[PDB]
Amino acid sequence: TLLNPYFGEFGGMYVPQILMPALNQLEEAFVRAQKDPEFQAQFADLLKNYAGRPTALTKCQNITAGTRTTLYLKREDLLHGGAHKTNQVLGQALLAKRMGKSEIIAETGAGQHGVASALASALLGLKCRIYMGAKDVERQSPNVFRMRLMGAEVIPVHSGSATLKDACNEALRDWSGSYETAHYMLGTAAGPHPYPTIVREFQRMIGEETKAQILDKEGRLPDAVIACVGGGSNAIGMFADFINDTSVGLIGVEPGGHGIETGEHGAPLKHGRVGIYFGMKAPMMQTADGQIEESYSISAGLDFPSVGPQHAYLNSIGRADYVSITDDEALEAFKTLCRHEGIIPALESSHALAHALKMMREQPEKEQLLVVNLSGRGDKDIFTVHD
Amino acid sequence: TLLNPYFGEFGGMYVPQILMPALNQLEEAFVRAQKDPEFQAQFADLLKNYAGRPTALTKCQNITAGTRTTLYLKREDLLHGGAHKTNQVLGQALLAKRMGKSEIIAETGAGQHGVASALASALLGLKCRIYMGAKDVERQSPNVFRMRLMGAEVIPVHSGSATLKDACNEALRDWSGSYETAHYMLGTAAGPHPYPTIVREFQRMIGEETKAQILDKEGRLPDAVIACVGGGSNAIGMFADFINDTSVGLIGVEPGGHGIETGEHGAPLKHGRVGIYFGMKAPMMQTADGQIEESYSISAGLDFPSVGPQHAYLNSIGRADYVSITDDEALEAFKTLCRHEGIIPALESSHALAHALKMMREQPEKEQLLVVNLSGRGDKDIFTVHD
Amino acid sequence: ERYENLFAQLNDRREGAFVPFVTLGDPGIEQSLKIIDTLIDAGADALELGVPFSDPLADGPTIQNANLRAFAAGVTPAQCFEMLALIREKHPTIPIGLLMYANLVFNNGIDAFYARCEQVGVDSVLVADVPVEESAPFRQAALRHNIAPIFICPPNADDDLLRQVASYGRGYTYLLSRSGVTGAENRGPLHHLIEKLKEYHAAPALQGFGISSPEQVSAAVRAGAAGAISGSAIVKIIEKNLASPKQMLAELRSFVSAMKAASR
Amino acid sequence: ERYENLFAQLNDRREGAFVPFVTLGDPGIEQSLKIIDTLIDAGADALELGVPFSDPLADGPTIQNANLRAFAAGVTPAQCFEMLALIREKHPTIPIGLLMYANLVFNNGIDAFYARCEQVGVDSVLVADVPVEESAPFRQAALRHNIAPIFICPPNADDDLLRQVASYGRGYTYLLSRSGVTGAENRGPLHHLIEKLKEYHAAPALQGFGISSPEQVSAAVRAGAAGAISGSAIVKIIEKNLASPKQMLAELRSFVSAMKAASR
Numbered sequence A, B: 001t002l003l004n005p006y007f008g009e010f011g012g013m014y015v016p017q018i019l020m021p022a023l024n025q026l027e028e029a030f031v032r033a034q035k036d037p038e039f040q041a042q043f044a045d046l047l048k049n050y051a052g053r054p055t056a057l058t059k060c061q062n063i064t065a066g067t068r069t070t071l072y073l074k075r076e077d078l079l080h081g082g083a084h085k086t087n088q089v090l091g092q093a094l095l096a097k098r099m100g101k102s103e104i105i106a107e108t109g110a111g112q113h114g115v116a117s118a119l120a121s122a123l124l125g126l127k128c129r130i131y132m133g134a135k136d137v138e139r140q141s142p143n144v145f146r147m148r149l150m151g152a153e154v155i156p157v158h159s160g161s162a163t164l165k166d167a168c169n170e171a172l173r174d175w176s177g178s179y180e181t182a183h184y185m186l187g188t189a190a191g192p193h194p195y196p197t198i199v200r201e202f203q204r205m206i207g208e209e210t211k212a213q214i215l216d217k218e219g220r221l222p223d224a225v226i227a228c229v230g231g232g233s234n235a236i237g238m239f240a241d242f243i244n245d246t247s248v249g250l251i252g253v254e255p256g257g258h259g260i261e262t263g264e265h266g267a268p269l270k271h272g273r274v275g276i277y278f279g280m281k282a283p284m285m286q287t288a289d290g291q292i293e294e295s296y297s298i299s300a301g302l303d304f305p306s307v308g309p310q311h312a313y314l315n316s317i318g319r320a321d322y323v324s325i326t327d328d329e330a331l332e333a334f335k336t337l338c339r340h341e342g343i344i345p346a347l348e349s350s351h352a353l354a355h356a357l358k359m360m361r362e363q364p365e366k367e368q369l370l371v372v373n374l375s376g377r378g379d380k381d382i383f384t385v386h387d
Numbered sequence C, D: 001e002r003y004e005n006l007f008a009q010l011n012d013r014r015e016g017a018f019v020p021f022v023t024l025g026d027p028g029i030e031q032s033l034k035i036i037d038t039l040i041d042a043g044a045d046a047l048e049l050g051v052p053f054s055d056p057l058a059d060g061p062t063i064q065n066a067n068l069r070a071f072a073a074g075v076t077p078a079q080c081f082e083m084l085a086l087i088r089e090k091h092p093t094i095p096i097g098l099l100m101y102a103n104l105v106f107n108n109g110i111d112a113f114y115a116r117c118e119q120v121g122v123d124s125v126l127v128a129d130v131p132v133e134e135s136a137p138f139r140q141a142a143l144r145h146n147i148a149p150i151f152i153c154p155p156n157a158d159d160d161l162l163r164q165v166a167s168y169g170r171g172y173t174y175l176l177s178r179s180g181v182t183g184a185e186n187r188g189p190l191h192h193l194i195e196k197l198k199e200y201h202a203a204p205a206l207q208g209f210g211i212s213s214p215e216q217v218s219a220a221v222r223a224g225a226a227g228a229i230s231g232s233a234i235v236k237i238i239e240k241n242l243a244s245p246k247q248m249l250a251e252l253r254s255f256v257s258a259m260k261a262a263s264r
Ligand SMILES: O=P(O)(O)/C=C/CCSc1cc(F)ccc1O
Pocket: C021, C048, C050, C058, C059, C063, C099, C126, C128, C152, C181, C182, C183, C184, C208, C209, C210, C211, C229, C230, C231, C232, C233
């Protein structure tokens, strides 16, 4: 391959032989795109004039009153679509187009990636096919209608546990037979190479913008940048530009569900076991017999039962640290931001905020410059948090 | 007064004697604020770093294919909160603060102004009181929960028709007794002076940004700028900077409901009668006996039964032109933008888009540079458009 | 000059004026006509009559409901003028003031509304939502048809306002005892205003808002005001006895006799 | 060397190999054991056995349901190895290949899984989600425990792949007749590959995917392939007759006899 498929022991290309030429094709189109100033200029224009780039960096004064912490939030919730997921799908769509592809295959759990894939395809003139577990379809009627209204075909998968896992399966099944006309738009920084590398690169703007932004407003790099970890895309996007800045701490937050000790959580990188699945070698929600299991969380969007290979790797060498936050903990942070800052955060992002809040509260006299990545909007979670 | 309360024959200050000193106070604080570089710098910082200013200007290529029209959309749907309403409430909140006020009184129909007033108060540390007709409260549970979650007090008004009209009444009743500690945050460019002038001025950024933006991208001013008219705030904000540019057409769109001819509409400026109500002289939804009536529309947010005085005036001298769009017409434009551009527009804004679409379709060979003000997001209308 | 005559008369009796308020058509036309005669018979010196309006932004719940009850009966503004004529054809000297909101008088011409008031025998008109700054056209029209334009003097009026009110008003000066809206639900020192108004030769002052007890009217008189207006306390008796009309009139009598006695 | 012996034997008979597939434990353990003996008795030359996995991303609905039915019966991977041992203790010469997914063999050590295969009498192992680029550890472990590592040759393999497959594989070369996933639901010219594989001294090729009729196996043999594999067509007969076990076995017999006859 032209690039390294592994991040230490993690990563790889574990797909049937039939899909290997599809992956080599994609990789090569990416290396070229990345060198093409015309691709770069087009990607840039779409981000600025269509998505709302650059997003703001907001100082939270009320929330940190009476402590020595200075908290700022990356305004990814202000991006068109309500989440960070939008940056990514635009680039991938431009890649599909570059390859001569006219069809898009998508995977979605909570619905967010589905909506983002659907909007990118409508804008760029691509036919979108989306796989959703029958359970999730029933559970997420609003996003399903949004998807269809945007011209996308929604297909319920009733196999297995009828959720994200099974949606991921049906998509590869489809792709193994249509790779010549269709391009698979993977939704996170995981899966077989070159997806983990491509998703990071197309999500890099985040930390890049945050750097200049904090440098302007404070004339210093932050002490730490925090982000939730479902599959790893928003987290790695924040991290990337700061990896070579050794003084900046990188903290990822995984869903703790009802509590790690109950086994009812979604924290594989820290409380799971390394396995091989979804074209990848990485930590996973697994039974003792190696049967792939489900991840649980109050937020539907942190359901991916595995995690990005670059995260497992940054953890092993000690570059980044990972922690977890329970359902009740994420609810508290949701409530607090609404009340003191007037911002309604996604229950996903709330996990990241909750940790920043703990960092403060636990050591209020500690001088600290923190940046939380507010990866999305919480209008979606009003009824959930209400019942 | 320091400024003119009238726009020709329209406008005024028709409130009980007891509220007159409150209005003179507000006016004077506004004249001062407007001269204060420190107020200006604070207002600017809040718009940029908290609200997401400047918003994008998006070219809609797919939608205008095969015609000679070039359409661009002002991305007000990308503002924090999902609507233009946010710019306004921040300024008014800073004004209340400047006056030594610590309490906010608010009026809301569909819920948008309620949410915007609630968020501004949470950020700026003000106690918010909100009046909502019992009918609207029941009809808008999501916004009511959003409001409360943001620390605001929601109060159902059961008097009269229990809708916007009656909410507007209870607020003035309250204000007539609390003006010494509380400030009334009016939600549109209407009501007694100085509200129509203040709301415009705090909504001016829109057209100001649009000018520079179109000048950069096309090196020419637009042929026409279009905007929906519920009460008039988003429309006037777009218009303002272009008023002295005689070659630029200004078009306002009023809800036609089931059709003007059925009497089931919300177009007073063009199909109502001049009356005196809500501290103002202006066109109004009225019975033959002068009893104030209700405005109807598929979009709940275009319910205000009257209209801003500056609009009635711009219409009389021929500077601006006003038209209407029916329910079915607004639904079509909603569907079309989702499908061809991947943007979900509020049913409010859809009325403006629908007219721009007619302008094109009716005369496809006409060269035209158009700008529609996309005043808000349509996630809110998914279920409505679905049933 | 109905007000002028009444006041000179009351002064010759070293007496204050007791003015009750009701909404025309509440709980019904016929019953309303009956309530009004009972009011006068029990001692009312003058009358303040509100015509049903959809958005009374200067009124509390009690009076808000009076408008609603009238609407439920189907009372229209045209039906109101018919009622007014009959009341005058029955009572020739009693001053009659109308409580109005802006749209109802501007609706089909400001001039024509005042002309209709003259033709019916109305004495004064207070438009609750028109401040002095906006009264010119209403003032002029009223004067032209021999109708007295009533101006409101708030408890916080500065010299400039006092001088304006004194100069433009006629019939009586509406001395607002409180801030807020109408309502006997909550009570309400006007000596300073009363003296200054007298100094600028203003029309005699009638204190209104929150007056609901005998002691309250005696106090108004002692302060120097020529009388007092009471609405919620009156309308509340109507609300209370809707199922027993006879009970209404009987209780309506006792209250206004007590209130009248307090102005002596 | 079970495969080597079988193929040399079949060649001496100028015959092709007919290899049926089933999921271990579908519809139940006991019934599965019964289906397998019926398969062999009716003429099967070798066997391809899949152990129940939660996410079979290379399988169509038919086989997806076989895994689900097995799961419903409570068949575990440990229970699978117990089944395999009994099958060998009963049939000593028949080649047995396992259809596997990556996690099940890596789960508790790659080495230990292959050691268990040896101890049970398994002959080959195909890991559906491990391409040549990632096979090193699986290849090495298999060879170390005398298990043949099965490599897949897609219909679009370039020279570099053909050479790699020929060099690393053993037992048999899995010639994919189609693109997509398993399923007799839709049918599928491999002459070029077959010749090149023979040129590079690859293990004998078995054509798999979409083979569901007698004519299909005769065609595979005519092309130059040493035999054919059929799964969906077999599993479909099990699905059809779940309520009548006896009916299942009887119909299972007729199909594989017909298919076997076609390789002569
Ligand atoms: O109910 P209360 O407090 O006794 C007051 C009676 C009603 C007097 S008439 C009036 C005057 C205004 F300036 C505004 C509204 C009105 O209804």
